[model samples]
Target: AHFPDTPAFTGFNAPSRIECDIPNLVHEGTIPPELNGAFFRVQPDPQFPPRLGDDISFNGDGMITRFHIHDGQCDIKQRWAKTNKWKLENAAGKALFGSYRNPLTDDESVKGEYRSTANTNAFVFAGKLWAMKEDSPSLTMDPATMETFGFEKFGGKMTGQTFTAHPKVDPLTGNMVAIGYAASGLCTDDVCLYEISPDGELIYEAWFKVPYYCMMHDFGVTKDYLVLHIVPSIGSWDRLEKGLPHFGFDTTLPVYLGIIPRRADLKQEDIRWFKRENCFASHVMNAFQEGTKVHVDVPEAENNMFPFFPDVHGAPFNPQQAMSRLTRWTVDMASNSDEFDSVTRLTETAGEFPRIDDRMTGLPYRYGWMLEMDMKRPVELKGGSAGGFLMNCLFLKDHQTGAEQHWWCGPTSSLQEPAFIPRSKDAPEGDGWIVQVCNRLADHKSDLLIFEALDIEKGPVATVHLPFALRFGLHGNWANAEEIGLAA
Candidate 1:
């Protein structure tokens, strides 16, 4: 099967269906002896040419990669999640699934098969790596072996048809809090809020409906509330039947943030919908409750972020409005007003893929990191973009002191989402190393760059070189040795 020559499928973004284990990778500096963990990330690489003859990068299959750091040495492994879609296609020796999430475009022979690519996020929970895409159930894998374990349904207890790629782990309770939009089916207004124990049990699920059927990609959790932002990446079954994109950005629709209490008896009426003008937002940095007020830090934009999704009103993609700035949205649960209390901009620098200390997730936190888009930076080699933006700087933002640090990845390099590794399990917030893959487009190789967590301005403390250049990835996480049963 021949891949397409489109921007999303060529050059450094090209598909490399490789699975191998390379131990003791070459490095430029010292790898922290104590930083014993595996950085698991997934790239959307198509195993076969598009069945529809054309497709977006999001339609590709999940190729999970693991960089194991142990005792100052690094090893690498890569594998496909082997979802039902992958398996069916593998058996046929060709593409069977159609477009990204539109099942109507599929072949007649493979109806009702699971269409999950499982390419969005790689999360380590309950000693299993969850390979996830928001459209269907998450596929679990052996964290140590990087082998697929099929889709997880918690022993037939989870009824939701879909699961979110971004699930917040409650800091206090050690429970994973997640929500599934389009829970009933495609384009449905139904959503299911779920809470799973650390032992991997589907303990609680609350059903509710959003104001509209849109892409609820990620949400946030405070100590007592679940914060969900309903942006207008709107979709419909009609659009699917009409052969249009699965979702389109509707500027006319207003955004809503639902603050729902974390209770077992939660109802549709219990959720408080706060209204705000529509804007583009995904991936919550962190959320916390302060008295009656709740705050969420996100990389907020003024227009659609994904170009492939296109505008609903036949408007061209606005490059200026597409740049995202780190902003905070604050709402008051105590007030009867439906309007937001405040929307404050935290940084002038545009960025996305925000990540903070996972230990401080869903709590009041200070240090945050992201892939900063610096368009003004020189570009020696053209034709490379990460999530539709030139992520050339590793950014660090201190929310409390209003301090920020940035380390540029030179002219020809781009960075993926940075994962924070705490110095130790009990270390203070941001007291660890920041690890992310750097795409050296000119050299056609990748480097896993490590830096001092807070002092990123000092540049990388180490750079672990890879023999091959990995494609752009969405989200990943670091699991310590003890968490995934890795021996140091």
Candidate 2:
């Protein structure tokens, strides 16, 4: 409901780089044979609309929804900034350059551009990059008329690839980089990088084979090099076949965070890996450089387990078995060596919105909240039984003292990622606004919530209600007055 002001179309006046009258497109269908069924299968359901569940769910039980369906097949959303319009397409449609959606209006339909397609793992960058499976050409079109612009492909012989969920563009150069893997055999893909031009040109490609087979999830790039987070690749069948403590198997898969310089050629020696305990079902949310310390946030560590897999089907995904503390690690980037020190270990009770409160000068620390869910218990319904009790957590921090305080909200259904909206450029340090989506009032829907950016510092801000329910979204970019078609 509290949509950030749209940034001004600064590139509007620039040369009409591409045509703008092409019709919008929507590519929704099955993946090609070469892709190896990576997407979840979609099926008809009486109760629930088409949806995407785990790969194993195709033969199992679960409802589906057409609008909310996850077809396991890859889909893309492209927007022509020149026209303020976009298109959603699939691998087949993208290959054929077919226009699917006409006059795409809803934010949900247009929001796919914010998701990374090619990457199996997700990463956070300045701007969002749409991930497309490797070798699968993306059809480009003018958003105004929805006409064909050209076909864009990933660089090199890379095929059957899963890319980083998101690609962050360098604010200075506008160049973007996405990390993914080239599928070779059953769990034998090599982690690789695909660099693209701002206009969507595939520029470069390279791969790395680590000592142990690691599932590359997310990566981060700094001025010097790229940071890669590697985890063990547990066999899909192991969940049921191996049972609890399934991840504890003798895995040569040593958890390591590797650093590879941007310019130098990538070799085994060039990569310095720091061994770490297994981080199960975990994601690297944020990686940034703050003064002398390089800060990172990994939110869901349950009882020491990185991923407390909750019981979706009979088997419980227990976070308590996992690490319970939110792991915050700091690295001395200045040193040529690779070493990191754990700065703080806060409880990981499943928080949603985690962000850096850059407003504070003395200690520009991270501030985020989580939607707490009762992992230990299951939800009981009037007619039947459900699982997981949902609640809200308002988290704040004292950077210097490494002290944190969490405030509890309600027992709701679902919540969206919290958005940190700074009040003003010149506003007092640590003074701003925070917004999140809460489903306290609705069963299947959620409402947008607003809080003082410094509400943890002061008190409550204001909650601006929404008319409709919003789907689960990753992160949102903000537009200032200058970018939102407003006169400065």
Candidate 3:
């Protein structure tokens, strides 16, 4: 019943939450002595069956999976992030909700409950663990116990309809910067940008109305500017009334980038909206400023990867058109015109789930990593992230040398974000271990694989076995043992 429609809601992608820990994981080789920390990941894990006929893997409850490693010993633990909606469903013995983000269709008992599955991303800041979704407020959790602490609003300063899934914790300022779309309501042009102090206080916020409503799944930031990509995955009031998905592609509309100064009050008129033809970027690797030009690195898709949100007239599109390499965008702020140059192909490999060293978040960085993918039909087993954008190879790329090194996770497996954990408190940039979780399709088991960041082609230096498989996740972060008070 779960997989009748597509591969999106089956196998490793299925909604299953369990708690397990191995005091000492059986490893084939030695674990890095310095690789000591708790790697935490949260994803949509449905607590109860869906009320609608078809279940969406992306519309499930949230679960936190922690791989705590220390002194060559590895332990794995999983827990469900209890939400008001999740609790309500459990008490009623079934799902009380209808479509995702559609409160009007929910049961009367769940009238005003938090509709968020609380299942997109997780971060550790201010000595606390936070589970976040773009459509809802950030929810705090005790990293050790996996217990919810209600909603996190930075002392009531965060006054918005939703928080962002990709909030950048400034390595340079010790503050956090984030952006939220649909900040006012569905199909509205509201986009809110804000900053939180190092102490976890929401200190700054501003709202900008774009020309149109966009999905804005993610964006890039630099030391002095915030880069906003206003692409065409859009929504409209009329479409919502017709019981359609909230988003659809508009190839006829021009894409834009709102280059806003990071320091001052954002005057909408002052924002330079750069125009470009149709394209899509789900994740940004990094952005930096050199002179008047700002460079943005990201994986590009020529057409919409998501089929449900095709062109306005519902024409088909190439789902894997952007799987060739890292595409670069050069926006010349000094240019009087509102257009940029051609898109440059940075590398020869194609992949997604990209990231650079967080320490070099908005600065110059030579190293980046992503999971390698192609146009091939993804291995049919169970779990999936995006419907077509699957992960099979762990790829590491260097900007300075134009070289690439990668590792294949095999034909029967898929990997999540390859999170980087620096060797020490002040480890040099890119000097860290890659902490990636892999799911095996055959047995439906998962493993936390730790590889030396520079030598990832050599495969896992350490492996932590998980009791069961997990649905592919959105985003995750790493913290030292002291933060989560890790396992044996």
Candidate 4:
């Protein structure tokens, strides 16, 4: 046994399901062509069922007996079940884009031989990787005559190791860099960077092994480097049960921020690794450039392990107590040096939302912002317990000296990712849109909230609401309206 399984698990078992109710909001007025609206390709937990696994099968006692086989007493094998279809509805729940349940059944298959072990005791587990090509034709139907037009296949492989988060696209190359891990055969927890061309071509694939296992959070490209922010910790499964205390305090497990310069002269050996002592679960917004500054917001280091695993009884586990800080680093590209010249650090507090604008839209200057929570009160008056502390905070930053600035947005925990949308010919100074999926804030079944580009120099401009609850997705690509069909 991994440890004392003495205490019973409390939290809700299986997966928590949320009701999907569409809102009636006006999207035709301001929906940008680049982000005309949001659409769901494949919703994992919500639309599709959760992945299942067996616990007792590994013991061999739950083998395929006569009674277990016929009566379905044995554990059911895990397979990818097909979903209904894709549909785009407005705030009024009106279908806008594609038809729902057009049945891409050709995309489904069965691989019974994929799993060799009758029980989980087998030495090796046989798995399947389902690949569907773009030529496979989409099962899209015309709403007018109920006719189908584009049946072009969408190309991609769905495997056990597939990354749930969307990839970040390089604005310059118009390619997406998807970083994920490799399992089975030669198993290793490393970052594999796959550069896929704009037209769906595999440009290049490379791998980099770090000192520890980190969940894929975020990555981006600067003028000359590919920056990766990784949080090295135990599995989320074990952490939820055993609590974070099982992984004791050690510098080896510190959050690592690595920089791989994009210069052709520099190879993998020339990469630089920076280790920060007290930061965990960090998100990197922008990388340090020659004349530009890098911004990072780290949440207060707390006893997440205890709250994560409350049942385990042993020596009291005191998680490392540390304050969140906003650090700035400057890079000198000409010298080919990896040394980060620390510019400034924010006041000690529990901060969360940190984002930066690197002028990818052919703008003049760059900007950044983050929501800083109150440090005195570690708990919130809500049902979420410690996790609730994330709610009710102030946004702050210092663009001038790269130090602490005054608060912008007031209290209220919103699931929002602050993005800087470029100003169009109509509205030039650019819009600072603090976009979020407002599910917890509203009583409606599904809430998609979009805050128009707020002039941080001023205040918020406009707000847009979507009809459905959009799942937490990472990264967004914005381009001119005319450039959409050209790439595809």
Candidate 5:
């Protein structure tokens, strides 16, 4: 399979179709013995070249990299989620699918086949690993073994055509809440919000219609609602027919935030659609209920953030406008107006991929961490380093104190999404560690850096070394040993 010579298909982003185990990875500092869990993250490393001759970095196959920490040592394992596309292409010794999520461009022999790359997020819930892609059903796997078990439909109980890459676990109930857009089919207005029991059963399903069809990548959950952002990374059958990307940014479209109540007797008309000016926002930091109002904190930008999905109006991408700030959007349920109550910019740092302590997933939380894109610092961008905008700093914002902390990764390195690991099951919020992958672009290597939570000015407490550099990843989660049946 001849891969393309494009930047997205070469160098650090090159496909490493590997499934192996590395015991006792090399390290620099002492790994916390109490940190006994696996950090599972996924990268989209294609198994074959694109059938359309070229494609975007977002369309690669899902390769899961699990760093299992136990007894002060880390063991690494990498495996690809064997979806239907992977198996079919393996038999043919080439890529059968043409483009990402556009089944209309697939090989006629494999038309209507399952085309989920399962490359967005590596999530663990109910003693299983979910390799997720929003375009299709979530593919379940063995958390301990990374063994693919095909698509999960809750034993044929779920009828939705799509599942969300970003699912939130309710802090109080332990139930996982997920959404499936295009529930009926591709580019449709129907969306389904699903609530699954802690035991992996589909407990509730609510269907609703959005103002328009767009890429609803992530959402926030509160004690009473599902906070959905409707950005205009939109698509249609006509765009697919014209051989364009599945989604395109439409600056002319107005944004909407849908606050849907989490209840059994939910109806379409019960949802509240709050309007806002056109902006680019993905990845919700956290959402919580305060009195009669609901608040959602997101990294909001003034223009389209993704250059791959060009503007629908044929306008050039605005980089300065793409720089996002941590913004809090509040909407009052008691108000007659459909507009936002407040649009407060919480931090000046331009960043994305935000995370909070999972214990406060839908509650009032004090601390939030994100990879900061501080372009003011000295940049040593190599040929193919996270070249768009360097996320060079790790930032922490304390909402209670109105204070912030920053940790810069130096000129030669970049960072990934930070995952907060609580010191223990019942530890106080932010009383834990921040773990993320660091890309040493100049050296062509990677490190798993761990820092004491809230101490960002200081450097990493521990740096677990990787023999090879991993491609930039989308999202991941930390699962405790007992949570995934890995307890001794």
Candidate 6:
């Protein structure tokens, strides 16, 4: 019943299971020959109208599209993830569920159905493509056909409430170290950090409770450490029992940063927790350890994102609290080992959804990119401050030096998260192109904007046009031409 019939619901649902096989497009300008791969992006696109009340963007079904870019010719295809919830809803030609995540509010028909949208992110591992969400199983798909292959749990080794949407793929060991913050149950704060070998083997898993329960959207991983941030976005069955939103901001609690070794033989006892205050980071750019120091970069915000949680006196909250600053935290295990660490402001601009070259994930990296956010813009939030979110700018920064490259997509167009496409197997860590999806406002159309990785200020070198506008998405990844042939 909280679903407001506003722009938040506008253009929210797309025709589910609709496939548009666009012909190969020979774009103008340059489409780097070395940038040969398929770029897959998924969004929570609803199938039918909501069963009750209106709908939130996060309550939609998962639909993914692919851009097959190789040798200057590009083809495109799209398909639904066909999750269990999606199948059940489609079979009845109506929504079979209720509410976003609170399962207690759902209809008895879907009493125990998988409520996760599976619309957060798309990742490639072990020659397979996965559509991921934080509270459900990873739904697999054919990268080439965009066909859903049900879900995966690493040969039944992954036993938890959900898998993280953002998992760090280590370059040195070619291993993936991931964590599920709410793996145990809702508001349990039971976190599990597990590692999967390069050949699709779940080599290790461990569960440990955090200082308190929070949203736990993303985490950071390095060759020697896995960094988990505990911000104060409170979520408890107490909220649902009170008929409130699943989550809200808590200003009184202390934020925690836990550092755990990435070794397979490690236990929760080996973890170290550092305390901080008044800081919130939903995503991390990268993490690295030099000697006894662990370095991590993130976009830091002042408070929780939503305004549902009432202040002590019901006074108004500032929307500006949602803006972010590019901050680099350097934790010296040698000095002040168990206290709040230090940070160096990387950029003055407010941004989020940070990204860097995957080749330097745990190693050292210089350049990074983030979606520049405008606090004044209307992004749909619980409060009335929804000015215009999904802002129209991108931020590229050089960590070594304090230089930046910023671009805007006019005033009516908004850009989604961009993926860094490597130039070649032997290319330098930051040498590549940035492929981003731009949403145009007037007709709800979209296009692929390709920018020179090293020279982002020059803007799109080639633009691949899309016949229809893609639904606004959360996260995406790049799959090399050979790597995407997982159907074999």
Please count the clashing residue pairs in each candidate, in the order shown. 0, 62, 5, 17, 0, 6
TM-score of 4: 0.55
| Candidate 5 residue-wise lDDT, 10-78, digit = tens | 877776777779979999888888888899998888999988778888889999989898888888899
* lDDT by residue (tens digit), candidate 2, 1-488: 12112211011111111211111112223212222111111111011111221111111111111111022222222222111122233321221111111112223544424221221211112222222222223322222122333333444444534454445555445567666543333245466666666655556666676545444544565555566666564323234344432222223344556665554256656666555655442454455666645555555342223222333243434534443335665565555555565546555455433454333211324454444443443433211001122434556654456666654444444444454545565665446555454444334433344455555434334333333333323333232323222223
Worst 10 residues of 2 by lDDT: 60-69
Find the 10 residues in a row with the least total lDDT in model 5. Answer: 380-389
What are the lDDT figures for the candidates, one per model?
0.89, 0.38, 0.77, 0.34, 0.89, 0.76
Model 1 Cα lDDT, one tens digit per residue, 128-179: 9999999999999999888889999889999999899998888788999999
Candidate 6 lDDT tens digits, 308-401: 5533234466667767788987777766556755878888888877889898888778899988875455433211112334556778898778
lDDT string, candidate 4, 309-341, tens digits = 222333344533333455543433333444444
What is the alpha-carbon RMSD of candidate 6 to the true structure?
Answer: 3.4
Question: How far is 266's C-alpha from truth in model 2 (Å)?
Answer: 3.1
Backbone clashes, candidate 5: 0
- Backbone clash total, candidate 4: 17
Worst 10 residues of 4 by lDDT: 61-70
Cα deviation in Å at residue 254, candidate 3?
1.5
Residue runs of model 6 more than 4 Å from their true location after superposition: 1-4, 11-18, 25-27, 307-317, 374-387, 486-488
After best superposition, candidate 6 residue 385: deviation in angstroms?
Answer: 13
- Name model 2 segments beyond 4 Å from true: 1-160, 169-177, 183-186, 194-204, 211-214, 233-253, 288-295, 300-316, 330-353, 357-391, 401-407, 422-432, 441-444, 456-462, 471-476, 479-488
Candidate 2: C-alpha lDDT: 0.38
* Deviation (Å) of 449 in candidate 3: 0.9
TM-score to native of every candidate shown? 0.98, 0.56, 0.93, 0.55, 0.98, 0.92
Would you list the rank order by lDDT, best first?
1, 5, 3, 6, 2, 4
